[PDB]
Structure formats: structure tokens, C-alpha cells
Amino acid sequence: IVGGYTCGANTVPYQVSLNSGYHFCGGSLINSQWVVSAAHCYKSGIQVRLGEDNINVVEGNEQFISASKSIVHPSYNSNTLNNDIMLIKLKSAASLNSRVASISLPTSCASAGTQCLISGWGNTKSSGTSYPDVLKCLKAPILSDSSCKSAYPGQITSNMFCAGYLEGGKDSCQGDSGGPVVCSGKLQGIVSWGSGCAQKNKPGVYTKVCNYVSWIKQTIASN
Numbered sequence: 001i002v003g004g005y006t007c008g009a010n011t012v013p014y015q016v017s018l019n020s021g022y023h024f025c026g027g028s029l030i031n032s033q034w035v036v037s038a039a040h041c042y043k044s045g046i047q048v049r050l051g052e053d054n055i056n057v058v059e060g061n062e063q064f065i066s067a068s069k070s071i072v073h074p075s076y077n078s079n080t081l082n083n084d085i086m087l088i089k090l091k092s093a094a095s096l097n098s099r100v101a102s103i104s105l106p107t108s109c110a111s112a113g114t115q116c117l118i119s120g121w122g123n124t125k126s127s128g129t130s131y132p133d134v135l136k137c138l139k140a141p142i143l144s145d146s147s148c149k150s151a152y153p154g155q156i157t158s159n160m161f162c163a164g165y166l167e168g169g170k171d172s173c174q175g176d177s178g179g180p181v182v183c184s185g186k187l188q189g190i191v192s193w194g195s196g197c198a199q200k201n202k203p204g205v206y207t208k209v210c211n212y213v214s215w216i217k218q219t220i221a222s223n
């Protein structure tokens with residue numbers, strides 16, 4: 001997250017870190033035994049880390065649970081990142097508390113102008129590299145469909161939306177992938193892609209989760 005702020009320990013209790021010996025991706029806990037992340041975050045050897053603030057320090061409140069099953073969207077296209085969404089089922093159920101809580105799925109899509117909270121342990125630099133150990137937060141608006149497709153001609157599908165600032169200086173970045181975009185207490189976005197970070201007319205591109213709620217619920221229910 002470039003141009004955000006320190007969330008505060010456990011102020012985003014649905015934010016998970018995906019870990020394969022290191023934090024590599026964000027995720028969103030949607031019930032005690034299921035995480036939503038980006039398909040492009042897919043790999044073997046995933047440990048889900050809940051209750052995390054500093055990902056380099058055990059502060060108490062952490063739950064480390066291995067993934068039992070990963071399900072990449074059937075239609076995930078790694079070339080275009082169309083349908084950039086993946087479910088992860090935990091070996092055992094998260095103990096739910098004030099620091100480890102689920103985020104509700106959308107009952108409908110969000111519109112441009114809605115303010116959202118984007119969070120993650122990703123890069124905080126537009127130029128160069130700096131990785132925070134503590135969770136960063138960004139308030140950013142959903143941008144117009146039209147604004148989004150003009151920034152990335154030919155690359156935005158109905159399964160993608162832009163959030164942020166065409167002026168730049170505020171954006172998701174490398175390491176934030178699979179993380180939450182929450183608007184009005186609903187998981188509307190997954191940190192998917194973009195061109196650079198916090199560059200002018202290059203807003204963050206997010207997986208449009210409201211397109212996936214029927215697939216998420218059917219898959220959870222059958223798995």
C-alpha cells in the first residue's frame with residue numbers, strides 16, 4: 001500500500017497473510033474455515049495467518065492454520081487475470097474473536113463513488129522498494145467503469161473494477177495481492193493488478209467479488 005497509513009493492530013480482523021515461509025499475498029476470512037484471495041496468489045505450501053499485525057513478530061492473537069484445499073476460479077485466466085479469485089479452505093476452523101472475524105460477501109455490486117478500505121503488507125514505495133511489517137490501510141473510492149477502461153484500454157473485464165486516484169500517490173502494490181477491498185462492511189474487491197503503484201492514470205485493478213458470490217457460496221457449501 002503506497003500513501004496509506006498504519007491500520008492499527010487487528011483493526012482489520014478479516015485481513016489474513018498467506019505465508020509459504022514468508023508473507024506473499026493477502027486474503028479475506030469469510031467464515032471460520034474459508035479464505036478468499038486472488039487466483040494469481042495460487043501456490044502449494046500455503047499457511048494462512050490470521051490475527052496478524054506485525055508479520056515478523058509474534059504479538060499473541062495470531063492463528064497459523066495450513067490450507068487443506070485451494071480452489072482457483074474455473075475460468076481464471078492467468079494471461080488477462082480475468083476471474084482473479086481463489087478460495088482456500090483451512091485444515092481446522094479459525095477460533096473467531098474480536099481480532100479474527102469474517103467479512104460479509106456482497107448481496108449486490110458497489111457503485112463508483114463508494115469509499116472502500118484496502119489493506120495489506122505490500123510495498124509502500126511508488127519508486128524503489130520498502131516492505132512494512134505492520135498492516136497498512138488506504139481509503140479509496142471505486143472509480144467509474146469508463147475511467148477504469150480508459151486507464152487500461154482493452155484489459156478491464158466486467159469482472160474487474162478500478163479504485164484509487166487518477167492523480168496517483170495512493171494505491172495497492174506488490175505484496176497486497178489477494179487482499180480485501182471492503183465497502184460498507186461488504187467484500188467487494190480482491191487486490192488483483194495494475195501498472196506500477198500510485199502512478200498517475202494507473203489506478204489499482206480489483207476482482208469484482210459481487211460477480212462471484214453465487215460461486216463462493218456454492219463452492220463453500222459443497223466443500
Ligand SMILES: [Ca+2]
Pocket residue numbers: 052053054055056057058059062
Ligand atoms: Ca505477528
Ligand SMILES: [Cl-]
Pocket residue numbers: 006007008011137
Ligand atoms: Cl483503519
